[PDB]
Design an enzyme around this catalytic site. Structure first.
Site, PDB file in Angstrom:
ATOM      1  N   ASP A 124     -15.892  -7.930 -23.753  1.00 25.81           N
ATOM      2  CA  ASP A 124     -14.951  -6.821 -23.776  1.00 25.81           C
ATOM      3  C   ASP A 124     -14.461  -6.568 -25.205  1.00 25.81           C
ATOM      4  O   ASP A 124     -13.541  -7.238 -25.673  1.00 25.81           O
ATOM      5  CB  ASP A 124     -13.778  -7.177 -22.857  1.00 25.81           C
ATOM      6  CG  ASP A 124     -12.725  -6.106 -22.778  1.00 25.81           C
ATOM      7  OD1 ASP A 124     -12.926  -5.030 -23.367  1.00 25.81           O
ATOM      8  OD2 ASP A 124     -11.691  -6.369 -22.108  1.00 25.81           O
ATOM      9  N   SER A 157     -14.881   9.901 -34.112  1.00 20.47           N
ATOM     10  CA  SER A 157     -16.076  10.697 -33.912  1.00 20.47           C
ATOM     11  C   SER A 157     -15.910  12.055 -34.587  1.00 20.47           C
ATOM     12  O   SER A 157     -14.812  12.594 -34.653  1.00 20.47           O
ATOM     13  CB  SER A 157     -16.345  10.851 -32.416  1.00 20.47           C
ATOM     14  OG  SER A 157     -17.385  11.765 -32.163  1.00 20.47           O
TER      15      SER A 157
END
Length: 330
Positions: free
Chosen positions: A35, A199
């Site tokens: 994770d 992004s």
């Protein structure tokens, strides 16, 4: 040193991925959910409330000759999906894919919430976010990667998740055969303890690319792709009959649909998520309403590039002095 381990979807939908991890002496192998959005290595154990164990493999520290109680240490974690667990702490030897850390904090669960109990395939979590998020008190503990880093050939790990197929976590090296083209690296903020990056934009299907900054986290421990409501609406608008369902808890679409791809930007590069990666199947057995793999982050408070996004790429988690993230197509 290096390590390399195969990671395997828990079910036919890729709801999560499990990776075998050796704990203790002799080894006890547990299948852990790696994770990159949290920083605790915790396991189902001989200390876990009996009624809260349903099929998981447990760690029994009393059977490990290298286990030592970390005296006075406790931990307690709550994830974004409302799940939680807590307990006490041992140090022990932990190996992943041939890479060994001695003295790793292994957080033994005394209590786990219902969703953990109900998932018989996940024996615990192995956190790979920054150690500043680790919940052990009163002495915060380091992640497996943080402990291994100085020994590694290069201070990196990579995630290469499969679509409906196994994939690979590598530690300490970049497998140049595992991706196509080049790796594009992008800046990371560690201020919130995550692999947080920005992004450069998105496209839906064959549509034009929209240049827009989207801050979010690279999180192998989240199944879906969670993005701003504007972006998510633009995606689902291209699917006839798709709608956001308050009763179901997100966007659903007719199971008869053919989904468009979704592209996200990494600098000037582009990662394409095929439409099929965005199908999470019937909302309930036999339903013709299917759950979407791209969902709004509104009310989570952070955008999350979870498995839906990451499995479309070869992803480098670069733990150099100034961390960065790398993405390649594959």
């Amino acid at each position: 040193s290096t390590g390399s381990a195969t990671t395997t979807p828990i079910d036919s939908l890729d709801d999560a991925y499990i990776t075998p991890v050796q704990i203790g002496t002799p080894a006890q192998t547990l299948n852990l959910d790696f994770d990159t959005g949290s920083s605790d290595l915790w396991v189902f154990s001989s200390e876990t409330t009996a009624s809260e164990v349903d099929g998981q493999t447990i760690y029994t520290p009393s059977k490990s000759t290298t286990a030592k109680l970390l005296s006075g240490a406790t931990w307690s974690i709550s994830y974004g999906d409302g799940s939680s667990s807590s307990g006490d702490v041992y140090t022990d030897t932990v190996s992943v894919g041939g890479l060994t850390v001695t003295g790793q904090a292994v957080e033994s669960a005394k209590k786990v919430s219902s969703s953990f109990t109900e998932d018989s395939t996940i024996d615990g979590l192995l956190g790979l976010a920054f150690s500043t998020l680790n919940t052990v008190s009163p002495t915060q503990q380091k992640t497996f990667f943080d402990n291994a880093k100085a020994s590694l050939d290069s201070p990196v790990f990579t995630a290469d998740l499969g679509y409906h197929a196994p994939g690979t976590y590598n530690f300490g090296f970049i497998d140049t055969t595992a991706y196509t083209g080049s790796i594009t690296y992008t800046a990371v903020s560690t201020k919130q303890g995550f692999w947080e990056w920005t992004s450069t934009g998105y496209a839906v299907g064959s549509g034009t690319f929209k240049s827009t900054s989207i801050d979010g986290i690279a999180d192998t421990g989240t199944t879906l792709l969670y993005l701003p409501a504007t972006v998510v609406s633009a995606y689902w608008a291209q699917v006839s009959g798709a709608k956001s369902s308050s009763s179901v808890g997100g966007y659903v679409f007719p199971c008869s649909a053919t989904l468009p791809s979704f592209t996200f930007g990494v600098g000037s590069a582009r990662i394409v998520i095929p439409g099929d990666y965005i199908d999470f199947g019937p909302i309930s057995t036999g339903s013709s309403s299917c759950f979407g793999g791209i969902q709004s982050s509104a009310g989570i408070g952070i955008n999350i590039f979870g498995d839906v996004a990451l499995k479309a790429a070869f992803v480098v988690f670069n733990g150099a002095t100034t961390p960065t993230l790398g993405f390649a197509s594959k």
